[PDB]
Paper text:
Glutamine synthetases (GS) catalyze the ATP-dependent ammonium assimilation, the initial step of nitrogen acquisition that must be under tight control to fit cellular needs. The dodecamer is organized as two stacked hexameric rings, and each polypeptide is organized into two parts, a shorter N-terminal domain (β-Grasp fold) and the remaining C-terminal domain.
The enzyme from M. shengliensis was crystallized in the absence of ligands, and two different crystalline forms, referred to as MsGS-apo 1 and MsGS-apo 2, were analyzed. MtGS-apo-TbXo4 was selected as a template for molecular replacement, and the structures were refined to 2.64 Å and 3.09 Å, respectively. A structural comparison of the monomeric unit reveals that MsGS has a closer fit with BsGS compared to MtGS (rmsd MsGS-BsGS: 0.749 Å, 341 atoms aligned, MtGS-BsGS: 0.847 Å, 338 atoms aligned), which exhibits larger deviations such as an extended helix α2 resulting from a seven-residue insertion. In the 2OG-insensitive MsGS structure, the side chain of Glu89ʹ substituting the MtGS Val94ʹ would collide with the 2OG position, and its negative charge would additionally lead to the ionic repulsion of 2OG. Moreover, in MsGS, most of the residues relevant for 2OG coordination (Arg88ʹ, Arg174 and Ser191) are substituted. The Arg62ʹ is not conserved in MtGS (substituted by Gly67ʹ) but is present in MsGS (Arg61ʹ).
Numbering used by the authors:
A (entry chain C): 2 to 58, 65 to 81, 87 to 221
B (entry chain E): 3 to 58, 65 to 83, 87 to 442
C (entry chain D): 3 to 58, 65 to 442
The structure:
């Protein structure tokens, strides 16, 4: 298909060498299978096989969503949010993404479409001897400005990295507690918003490290 | 010719030194570094050396021109050549593991059979303290985890990149169950190319881990209480270009050749364990409660038996032998599975009934009723079974078989006499 | 009576607390401390407790009045402590068959019906190690050798205190000396009946470990605490007496050795693989049963010149005896002597002829020449000895189904835990290369 031709154009243009077949377990934790770019044609066609015991907390296929192909702004790497199906082809009803898709399709039968715009709060803590702590990086309060808010460069990088992945943020600010922050998301359909929430957590934790 | 192509790559990449790689009976890579001026001598009459290193006296290194590769870590550049060992007269040295696999493959080729192997290589990435390696995981990640939970993404990315630069195609890589554990799934290739590729991966992973101040290990059970590293070998047999394991008219689309191959492997599996699980530590991996198989059963994809028969059919029909560990000599391991599997096909050895029930959940009285055997519990126990297996001793040769027994019993006799810390912790204060 | 003598010693030495000692199947001493006011209740109807500790429910402690001894380490304020070895019995009154002391008593009573009495004189080897940060270590206190004298033997004051404390408890010792390994020592006991000797063995371990802690040291009866050096053994000098006279002596027979000696040796050697589970009960006990050290590994019997499993020393007459050199000091003495008595008496009863005496140095012989003489080997692992003990119907019936099952359950729990462990040797041997 053409979406697939689009993907391979971006691959040669940005020199993508590895692709992450992202997915999520029942607990919302992101999981992935890293494949070299040579296997991207196999992933977009018959799919990549793996073990589905991880989704719970033994054989399934990763089905990449071509609309979710994004180059990671940090040789280059790319990601693809995948839906899970059983080896025969039927969708696995244990996949959280497939569950939201079903419920949205039922709502679509009644002409209903839900739009969600979450306010994502999080903390930025210091690290001691390579391990994470619960010690706030900054001693800031509600809507505070630098140098009271020390995490202004990291938040600036988070929103910049998100914009570089077809993601639009409404606003970001320091929250009530020390080292606490919030990123307010723009309105979008439940599936795109949930994909965006997982991406934000991944980007925020990666840039914090 | 291939020699002319080698010398063109030499002048293009400015190669100044070439490594004449080879492996001992234990699977450890050995080499002779020669300057580029001696490359013509190596590809012609060969380079002489002392063959007593393979045991664990004089011979000649015969480079395989198809295995010429430039090492991506730029020095001037360096290159490598996987070598076959020959006696000074010219006849092949039967003690060379690569020659042993080549023989067994040539025997299979006479019957129109070609075995394709696609191993799942598990390994650990540990921290280094005071310049010495440790068993402390670099990351605190779990099954299929993503960064920052998986901190070894750049080292893994660098491994697969370096492999791709040496005519190597990887299927997928991911974080495994235990902390700091990872897996790199290889794609199907002939037994010889796959074994060459397995040795290259271990060399590249350990070299690149040292570059980042880490230590990569293919040890079967480096940490007690967590999952151990395995080498699940996806095996497929091909007869005259077509998949010999596929039959569309047979039940479950499984040919009789698949059943007889499985039956042959399971008949000699206790003896194969000495080759595929060769260290004393390999038996600390073969314990219940972890991904590793302990009971001798074969079944479908849903259950985790010693031999698995996955869903893919047609040209992708195959079995998955999940008993081996990544510390085995791949040349000798694939030769042992080929010889046992082909003996089953030849003698028409029927395998036992498929055990689709969860074998771990069954009580000992239920397992006894179904007649489920167990893999050897110790290295001594597997070597005793390997000693009596006349098929595998003849397939690997009296030279390789004796060297395996001598090295394993030297390790076992040293290990059994040792007073381990567990004994001091359990008996010193009370007794 | 003996109870009246106990209460006179109580008032004389000012005893305020009494320890109702007993042992579990593993030979570890257990006790119930009672104030002196409850001593009359202990000697009369007995003290109740929980018998789940013996295996590894409600029962009664039955003190043996002949075992009343005042502990020489005087307590605080002139107050003194005393001990009493107890037999276990069920609430109804019947003796509880799971008690190791009761098992030895039964086997001795069965021997007494036929007029046989076994006398034992064990050679108790042990190590004296340093303590670091309040925890025991395997570092020898001294760097002494075989029969060494101070200052090479630094543990002369503590050994002197051990023998002095034992003499103060009706215990006579033959001799004590430094052994081959660094910080290793041996205390040779005098000959006595199997019950008194087993009581004495338990007392020695308790006294040695208590006095070692007083000097900031740790005494251990572990079979092989250090790799590469000699291990601690318990060579049991055994003699059988029929109607007051030595049943092992015959002045007209060759070597002045009676047929009863040969049949006793034959019986012990027949069941020695099974006896090893009792006499060498720990996983560590098999690290001691390795060549190159004093410990026997091959199943042979011979004269004094050669070191074998069973050795028949030169002394004759009333001192005629055999020396079973396979046991280690970590074994339960009550069970070890019961197993040797049952196997030895079965040999005498069934007239079991022992194999030919191997006077040649067995260690120097090649592996080919050993099979030709029919030379066997002791079990290499604890699981291997337990498998042999499980099939020995004589020893399982002699020790009882309760004791035998408890030994198998404890040994297999330790084995299953030990076999799954990843020892440091494996990391040292394989981590860097593989
Ligand atoms: Mg697998
Ligand atoms: Mg002696």
């Amino acid at each position: 298909g053409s979406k697939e031709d689009e993907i391979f154009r971006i691959v040669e243009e940005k020199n993508v060498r590895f692709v992450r077949l992202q997915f999520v377990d029942v607990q919302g934790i992101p999981k992935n299978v890293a494949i070299p770019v040579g296997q991207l044609e196999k992933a977009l066609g018959p799919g990549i096989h793996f073990d589905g015991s991880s989704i719970e907390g033994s054989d399934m296929v990763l089905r990449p969503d071509p609309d979710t192909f994004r180059v990671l702004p940090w040789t280059a790497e790319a990601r693809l949010i995948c839906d899970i199906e059983l080896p025969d082809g039927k969708p696995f009803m244990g996949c959280p993404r497939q569950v939201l898709k079903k419920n949205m399709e039922e709502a679509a039968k009644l002409g209903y479409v839900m739009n969600t715009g979450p306010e994502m709060e999080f903390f930025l803590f210091k690290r001691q001897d390579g391990m994470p702590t619960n010690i706030p990086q900054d001693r800031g309060g509600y809507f505070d400005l630098a140098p009271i808010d020390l995490a202004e460069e990291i938040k600036r990088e988070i929103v910049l990295v998100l914009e570089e992945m077809g993601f639009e943020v409404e606003a970001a600010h320091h929250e009530v507690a020390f080292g606490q922050h919030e990123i307010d998301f723009k309105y979008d359909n439940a599936l795109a918003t949930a994909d965006n929430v997982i991406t934000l957590k991944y980007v925020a934790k990666t840039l914090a490290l | 010719s291939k020699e002319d192509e080698i010398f063109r790559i030499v002048e293009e990449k400015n190669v100044r030194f070439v490594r004449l790689q080879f492996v001992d009976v234990q699977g450890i890579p050995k080499n002779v570094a020669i300057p580029v001026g001696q490359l013509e001598k190596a590809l012609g009459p060969g380079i002489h050396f002392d063959g007593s290193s393979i045991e664990g006296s004089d011979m000649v290194l015969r480079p395989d021109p198809d295995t010429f590769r430039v090492l991506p870590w730029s020095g001037t550049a360096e290159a490598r050549l996987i070598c076959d060992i020959e006696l000074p007269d010219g006849k092949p040295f039967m003690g060379c593991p690569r020659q042993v696999l080549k023989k067994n493959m040539e025997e299979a080729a006479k019957l129109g059979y070609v075995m394709n192997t696609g191993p799942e290589m598990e390994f650990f990435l540990f921290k280094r303290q005071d310049g010495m390696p440790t068993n402390i995981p670099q990351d605190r990640g779990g099954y299929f985890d993503l960064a920052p939970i998986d901190l070894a993404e750049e080292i893994k990315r660098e491994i697969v990149l370096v492999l791709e630069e040496m005519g190597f195609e990887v299927e997928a890589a991911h974080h495994e169950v235990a902390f700091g554990q990872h897996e790199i799934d290889f794609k199907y290739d002939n037994a010889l190319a796959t074994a060459d590729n397995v040795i290259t991966l271990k060399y590249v992973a350990k070299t690149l881990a040292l570059q980042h101040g880490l230590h990569a290990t293919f040890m079967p059970k480096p940490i007690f209480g967590v999952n151990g590293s395995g080498m699940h070998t996806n095996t497929s047999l091909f007869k005259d270009g077509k998949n010999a394991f596929y039959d569309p008219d047979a039940p479950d689309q499984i040919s009789d050749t698949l059943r007889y191959f499985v039956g042959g492997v399971l008949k000699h599996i206790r003896a194969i364990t000495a080759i595929t699980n060769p260290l004393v530590n390999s038996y600390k991996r073969l314990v219940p409660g972890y991904e590793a198989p302990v009971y001798i059963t074969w079944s479908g994809p849903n259950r985790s038996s010693l031999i698995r028969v996955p869903a893919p059919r047609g040209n992708s029909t195959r079995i998955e032998i999940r008993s081996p560990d990544p510390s085995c000599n791949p040349y000798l391991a694939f030769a042992a599975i080929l010889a046992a599997g082909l003996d089953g096909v030849k003698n028409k050895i029927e395998p036992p009934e498929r055990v689709e029930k969860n074998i771990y959940k069954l009580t000992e009285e239920e397992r006894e009723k179904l007649g489920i055997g167990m893999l050897p519990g110790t290295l001594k126990e597997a070597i005793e079974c390997f000693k009596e297996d006349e098929l595998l001793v003849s397939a690997l040769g009296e030279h390789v078989s004796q060297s395996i027994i001598n090295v394993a019993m030297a390790d076992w006799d040293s290990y059994r006499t040792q007073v381990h810390q567990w004994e001091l912790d359990r008996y010193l204060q009370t007794y």
